[PDB]
């Protein structure tokens, strides 16, 4: 028997099943180092001006 | 008094504008020492939003299905 496999049979990706379930991680990594703490919310304007020696307002 | 009637001003205008100024520059010199104050202490530890120079972005960082099994 055993027809020969034409082109292009010895390709198209294929799923399977195994026993395990795919575990996380595998790059054995720490967690996230640091949020950002996201600087969000509306504006008030210029309190007292650019509070520089002078030009208030 | 023809003086003060057409001419000067009130001393409680004056005292009063000049509690309002002092005032004012009270809070702009709090506000200054604020200013420094954060500054140095967000340089110093790096959790504020001002001094994030530019890192790398990981857009391009892609997982997929290599050539070599060992990646």
Do not use: C
């Not at chain 1, 008030?44 to 509070?51: C, D, E, L, N």
């Not at chain 2, 500054?39 to 972005?57: C, E, H, N, S, V």
């Amino acid at each position: 028997g055993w027809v020969r496999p034409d082109l292009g049979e010895l390709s198209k990706v294929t799923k399977v099943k195994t026993d395990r379930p795919l575990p996380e991680n595998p790059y054995h990594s720490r967690a996230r180092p640091e949020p950002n703490p996201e600087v969000e919310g509306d504006l008030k304007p210029a309190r007292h001006g650019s509070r520089l020696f002078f030009w208030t307002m | 008094r023809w003086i003060a009637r057409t001419f000067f001003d009130a001393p409680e205008k004056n005292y009063e504008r000049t509690m309002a100024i002092l005032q004012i520059e009270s809070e702009k010199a709090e506000l200054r020492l604020k200013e420094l104050e954060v500054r140095r202490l967000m340089r110093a530890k790096g959790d504020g939003p001002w001094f994030q120079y530019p890192t790398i972005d990981k857009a391009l960082i892609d997982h997929s299905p290599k050539a070599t099994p060992d990646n």
